[PDB]
Structures are given as structure tokens and as C-alpha cells.
Write an enzyme that holds these catalytic residues in place. Sequence first.
Site, mmCIF file in Angstrom:
data_model
loop_
_atom_site.group_PDB
_atom_site.id
_atom_site.type_symbol
_atom_site.label_atom_id
_atom_site.label_comp_id
_atom_site.label_asym_id
_atom_site.label_seq_id
_atom_site.Cartn_x
_atom_site.Cartn_y
_atom_site.Cartn_z
ATOM 1 C CG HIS A 43 48.510 44.093 37.290
ATOM 2 N ND1 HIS A 43 48.102 43.845 38.584
ATOM 3 C CD2 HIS A 43 47.408 43.955 36.515
ATOM 4 C CE1 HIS A 43 46.810 43.566 38.591
ATOM 5 N NE2 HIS A 43 46.367 43.618 37.347
ATOM 6 C CB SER A 111 43.295 44.349 39.280
ATOM 7 O OG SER A 111 43.678 43.038 38.949
ATOM 8 C CB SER A 113 48.722 41.303 42.470
ATOM 9 O OG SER A 113 49.695 40.334 42.122
ATOM 10 C CG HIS A 131 50.319 45.106 42.802
ATOM 11 N ND1 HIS A 131 51.224 44.204 42.285
ATOM 12 C CD2 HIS A 131 49.332 45.220 41.879
ATOM 13 C CE1 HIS A 131 50.801 43.784 41.106
ATOM 14 N NE2 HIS A 131 49.655 44.384 40.836
ATOM 15 N NE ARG A 139 33.956 47.386 36.235
ATOM 16 C CZ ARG A 139 32.654 47.106 36.257
ATOM 17 N NH1 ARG A 139 32.149 46.325 37.212
ATOM 18 N NH2 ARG A 139 31.851 47.601 35.320
ATOM 19 N NE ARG A 140 37.818 38.100 33.589
ATOM 20 C CZ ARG A 140 38.413 36.948 33.293
ATOM 21 N NH1 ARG A 140 38.115 35.854 33.979
ATOM 22 N NH2 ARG A 140 39.302 36.892 32.309
#
Length: 190
Positions: A43, A111, A113, A131, A139-140
Site C-alpha cells: 500500500h 490486498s 484497497s 489499487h 493475508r487472511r
Amino acid sequence: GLYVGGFVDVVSCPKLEQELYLDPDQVTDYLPVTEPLPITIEHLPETEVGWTLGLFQVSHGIFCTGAITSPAFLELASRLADTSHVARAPVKNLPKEPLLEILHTWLPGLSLSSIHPRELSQTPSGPVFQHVSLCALGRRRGTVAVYGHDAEWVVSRFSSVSKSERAHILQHVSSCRLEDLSTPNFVSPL
Ligand SMILES: O=C(O)c1ccc(NC(=O)c2cccc(CC3CCCCC3)n2)c(Nc2ccc(F)cc2)c1
């Protein structure tokens, strides 16, 4: 020219104080996304390494395919993959494609956003997504990202993606510009 693929975690206002992971169904009404979004690291905005090629809701979650196109990043990563004991330490010994293994290991998370879910209750004014980041941590719900040289091989690696879904994902990927994608802004700290 690398492709990346996997199921994403959806994160609202990531990095900030009031960060919040989102249930995929909180944003599935705003999928699919076919216009390219930047792919960054963790990010961080000055670390664009590529561009998404499609974000699709799928049984099992939200799937992302992307292109890693930054010459500076690809050269840095491939150099480390071939010469760095540190980069290679957590990877199996003597891998055939070190660059793909090093990315698969060190940046396993995708991930996505998004804006805050409060904006998602009723009609968002502007873009819902900002993005996708390659991430070392966090990470989940997402799968471990897969890196490859052809998009088909990448999408294939996910048994949780049916032949039909894989055909749809791949349809929009091939329609995407590859040499036409703008040059990402990543600069090598070396
Ligand atoms: O300010 C500094 O001096 C500085 C210090 C440390 C940095 N990174 C990490 O600690 C770090 C940790 C986990 C994963 C990665 C990604 C990278 C892993 C190896 C193969 C390419 C992907 N980087 C960075 N960021 C960084 C950006 C890309 C890269 F290829 C290497 C480092 C910068």
C-alpha cells in the site's frame, strides 16, 4: 513480463489508524473491475510495479489477475533471486525459476484497497477501489499469490476456480493492453 494471480483480501483505508478488512460481499456489487488499477507493494504509493488486468467475483471469493511490468522492479527482483542468500533462504533449495519462487514466498498476499463500508451502504460518489498491493503480511481470506510467465498457467493453479470462471477471467486478460500499460513508478532503492 510476469503475471500474478490469486484471491484477494479486501481492505478499507489500509495502513491508516481505522483500517478494516471487508467481507467480499460488501464490494461484490461493484465488481467486476476491468480497468487497470495500480499494483503496489504494501500500500505504498511510490512502489507501483504493475497493473491489474481484471478483478472478478467468483464462487470462493474475489480473484485478481495482474501484470508485473516495472523494469526496475523485475530487474531488482531477478537479480536478488539469482544472487541473494537472504532472498533464497526461505525458499526450497535450487528452484528452477528462482524469481517466481522468491515472489511467491516473500509477497504471498494480494490486498485490494477499497473505500470505507459506510460509503458502500448507499451509492458511492467515486471509485470504490484504489489499487491492489503485493503484501508481505496480512493475508487472511486471500490465497497465496501465484506468479508466472503466462496468465493461463497462473489461473490454472487455483482448483477453487472452475473451467468456466477460468475462461471468463482469461477472456478479459487477453483483451488488455500489455505494451500499452503506463510505466509504473517503482524505483529501485539500490
Ligand atoms: O528503505 C529501504 O532501504 C528498504 C528496506 C527494506 C525493504 N523491503 C523489505 O524489507 C521487504 C520485506 C518483505 C518483502 C519485500 C519485497 C521484496 C522481497 C525480495 C524480492 C523482491 C520483493 N521487501 C525495502 N523495500 C523493497 C522493495 C522492493 C525490493 F525488491 C526490495 C526491497 C526498502
